[PDB]
Amino acid sequence: GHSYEKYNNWETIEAWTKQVTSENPDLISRTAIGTTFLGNNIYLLKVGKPGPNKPAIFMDCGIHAREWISHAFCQWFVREAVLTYGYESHMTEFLNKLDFYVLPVLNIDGYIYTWTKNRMWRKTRSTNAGTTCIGTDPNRNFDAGWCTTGASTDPCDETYCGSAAESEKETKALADFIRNNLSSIKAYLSIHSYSQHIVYPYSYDYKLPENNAELNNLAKAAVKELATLYGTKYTYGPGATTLYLAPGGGDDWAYDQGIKYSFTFELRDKGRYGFILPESQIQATCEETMLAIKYVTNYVLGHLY
Ligand SMILES: CC(C)CCNC(=O)[C@@H](CC1CCCCC1)NC(=O)N[C@@H](CCCCN)C(=O)O
Ligand SMILES: [Zn+2]
Ligand SMILES: [Zn+2]
Ligand SMILES: [Zn+2]
């Protein structure tokens, strides 16, 4: 009983990844990039019409377990791509020229835990030495100025860096895929919630990126496109300046690998509902974010490297 306008559990999402690929074989192809701590398969969807020497964009959802709207957006991106292809001028051009590597749920173990035991869970579900405290923050487990100021050495903390960089199977499976497809990946997008922010490097240290002027102007125009629908106000700028010091992030790591277009999207809202955003707000949040994602996609095509 799947629905794009409702929050679906992992059993429903897994059944959807198989069915959406079978219903649309010419547009979507499904593969398993790895396994989680509990043993669940990390599924990845390649969206677009196949072809040779195609550039790609990587998009992940659900790094943090409680951010339910992030998981819901990845499903809506696939929904639009199969319904508007051949009917919408821009989406048709995007899928024909580019490939979309969509990872619907990264932290699967944590997401099952939010449906069964604790709704407010953030980290993974891995064991730690010398304590009964469980979990490691995946957005603090990447090899980009790992476990410095902003990340915690305490396993009982929500911002736990881990025993080592890429100590989690979920963090390694994501990083290995990017390394194996570095020459093709031109953009990295990380869907999260909440605050209504568009974050670009750097977060591990107080420093501006090489193409800071370009990333500032691109985020500015992407903010405007989202606002045209429901008037949703979004803020932008680099991580350490706008937010806080968050070392060992997926967006910061991707940038240091060569992906000059790296972004972190924080969805609805500002604090009224927070992580527990209602089902009645899914279609509104997904449609506005689509306009911002489509604008970033359009820019990347015109500035291929
Ligand atoms: C309580 C305290 C420990 C903060 C925990 N943070 C979060 O739960 C979320 C959402 C939000 C919670 C309320 C304050 C504003 C942020 N924020 C979030 O996940 N932020 C990203 C920032 C991404 C920066 C790009 N790498 C992260 O810390 O991974
Ligand atoms: Zn997050
Ligand atoms: Zn639509
Ligand atoms: Zn230009």
Swiss-Prot record:
Catalytic activity: Preferential release of a C-terminal lysine or arginine amino acid
Cofactor note: Binds 1 zinc ion per subunit.
UniProt-listed Enzyme Commission number(s): 3.4.17.2
Cofactor: Zn(2+)
Keywords for the protein's UniProt record, in alphabetical order: Carboxypeptidase, Cytoplasmic vesicle, Disulfide bond, Hydrolase, Metal-binding, Metalloprotease, Protease, Secreted, Signal, Zinc, Zymogen
Positions contributing to Zn(2+) binding: H64, E67, H192
An example Gene Ontology molecular-function term: metallocarboxypeptidase activity
Any GO BP annotation: proteolysis
Protein location: Secreted; Zymogen granule lumen
The protein's name in its UniProt record: Carboxypeptidase B
